[PDB]
């Protein structure tokens, strides 16, 4: 409600009352979580054209003799098809020798 956004301050002159911006229309606290998630169409479409830059950069890094620059990856750090954070994670070489996490997680319900 627009009648629950009033705050007062008594600092120098007196108790000055003010109101939050609600004169346009009714208030809407959470419009939708769906509009903040980058849904599957946008996610898959963007992340499809993400690794291609990583392979043009990995190819560029191997041709130019450059290392994995986190600054160059900051533009392709968003999500990846899988997490890009796992690509440059701390256990990258210690977690890569384990295949089948989805099946192990699925039957965890029965464990």
């Amino acid at each position: 409600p627009q009648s629950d956004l009033r705050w007062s301050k008594q600092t120098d002159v007196g108790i000055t009352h003010f109101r939050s911006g609600m004169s346009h229309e009714e208030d809407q606290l959470i419009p939708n979580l769906y509009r903040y998630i980058q849904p599957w169409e946008s996610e898959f479409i963007d992340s499809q054209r993400v690794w291609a830059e990583y392979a043009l950069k990995r190819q560029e890094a191997i041709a130019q003799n450059r290392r994995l620059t986190l600054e160059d990856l900051e533009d392709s750090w968003d999500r990846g098809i899988p997490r890009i954070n796992t690509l440059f994670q701390k256990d990258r070489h210690t977690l890569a020798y384990d295949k089948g996490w989805r099946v192990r997680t699925d039957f965890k319900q029965y464990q």
Partner: peptide, 27 residues
């Protein structure tokens, strides 16, 4: 009644666990 009561999802007469009545004058 300050709200529009049209942007709401389907309808909201009274959310007070007492909606015995059912009418809007649609017919």
């Amino acid at each position: 009644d300050h709200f529009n009561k049209t942007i709401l999802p389907k309808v909201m007469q009274v959310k007070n666990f007492g909606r015995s009545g059912r009418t809007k004058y649609t017919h």
